From a paper:
PMT-based O-mannosylation is an evolutionarily conserved and vital process, key for cell wall integrity and protein quality control in fungi. PMTs are divided into three subfamilies (PMT1, PMT2, and PMT4) and form functional dimers either within or across subfamilies (Akasaka-Manya et al., 2006; Girrbach and Strahl, 2003). In these structures each subunit has 11 transmembrane helices (TMHs) and two large hydrophilic loops oriented towards the ER lumen (LL): loop LL1 between TMH1 and 2 harboring a catalytic DE motif, and loop LL4 between TMH7 and 8, encompassing a so-called MIR domain, whose function remains unknown. MIR domains have a β-trefoil fold consisting of six β-hairpins arranged within a pseudo-threefold symmetry.
The high resolution of the Pmt2-MIR (1.6 Å) and Pmt3-MIR (1.9 Å) structures allowed for a detailed analysis of the respective structural properties and ligand interactions. Amino acid ranges for Pmt2-MIR are 339–401 (MIRm1), 402–466 (MIRm2) and 467–532 (MIRm3). In order to understand the role of PMT-MIR domains in protein O-mannosylation, we analyzed the Pmt2-MIR structure for specific surface properties. On the protein surface two regions reveal high sequence conservation, in the following denoted as sites α and β (residue ranges see Figure 2) in accordance with general CBM terminology. For Pmt2, H362 and H364 are fixed in a defined orientation by a complex hydrogen-bonding pattern within the strictly conserved site α in the interface between MIRm1 and MIRm3. MIRm1 site α, which is directly adjacent to the conserved L361 of the core, is completed by residues Y380, D384, N386, F504, and Q506 forming the wall of the cavity. An almost identical arrangement is found for Pmt2-MIR site β in the MIRm1-MIRm2 interface. Both cavities are filled by ligands present in the crystallization solvent (glycerol in site α [also in Pmt3] and sulfate in site β). Although Pmt2-MIR displays a pseudo-threefold symmetry typical for the β-trefoil fold classified as Type C CBMs, the analogous site γ (the third binding site present in β-trefoils) is not present in MIRm3. However, on the surface of the β11-β12 loop a two-residue insertion is present, which is specific to the PMT2 family (including Pmt2, Pmt3, and Pmt6) and human POMTs. This loop forms a surface exposed ligand-binding site in Pmt2-MIR, from now on defined as PMT2 family-specific site δ. The three residues form a trident that has picked another glycerol ligand from the solvent via hydrogen-bonding to the arginine side chain and to the backbone amides within site δ.
Author numbering: 340 to 532
């Protein structure tokens, strides 16, 4: 089953050395924007779960919708943390450890937020033979670009301070090289219905 808008709940794994799972929780940044932390995490738990929602300002996905909408590279989506309902978010705020990159946070909901909540998928590799323009669990590698800031979601390899449970720093990288695997991700788990 290809990944769908709204109904697909996924975990998302980073492909650099020591890369792990995109993660959030209710604790906030002590400096920076003071918004909700986003990290990478080395174990499997429900705080690794995300789903894709429509771009800011369009109708939120509803289970009452009858048609399935498969994710498309190049389309703007929000990436929503399932346990907290916050949107993956960035902005021109320095990251907590990689001070030359941008902080990535969880922000707002279906009402609260703005166009900095819009992200765009770019497929970098398909090892399978399925539709090369769709996302497939495990076998599709992709980058996740913030549309407004132009930067790429990345796990830097830095550990956070104790205030982030010593989890892995996530930033939005400015002008990375295309093959930088800190910016490459895959769907690691997929549950739908």
């Amino acid at each position: 089953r290809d990944i769908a808008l709204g109904s697909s709940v996924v975990s998302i794994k980073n492909q650099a050395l020591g890369g792990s799972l995109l993660h959030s929780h209710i604790q906030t940044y002590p400096d920076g924007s003071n918004q909700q932390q986003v990290t990478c995490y080395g174990y499997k738990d429900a705080n690794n779960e995300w789903f894709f929602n429509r771009e800011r300002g369009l109708p939120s996905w509803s289970e009452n919708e009858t048609d399935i909408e498969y994710l498309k590279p190049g389309t703007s989506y929000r990436l929503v943390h399932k346990s907290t309902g916050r949107n993956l978010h960035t902005h021109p705020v320095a990251a907590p450890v990689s001070k030359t990159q941008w902080e990535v946070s969880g922000y707002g909901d279906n009402v609260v937020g703005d166009n900095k909540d819009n992200w765009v998928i770019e497929i970098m590799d398909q090892r399978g033979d399925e539709d090369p323009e769709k996302l497939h669990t495990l076998t599709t590698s992709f980058r996740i670009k913030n549309l407004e800031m132009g930067c790429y979601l990345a796990q830097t390899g830095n550990s956070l301070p104790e205030w982030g449970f010593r989890q892995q720093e996530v930033v939005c990288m400015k002008n990375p090289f295309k093959r930088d695997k800190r910016t490459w991700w895959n769907i690691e788990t997929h549950e739908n219905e």
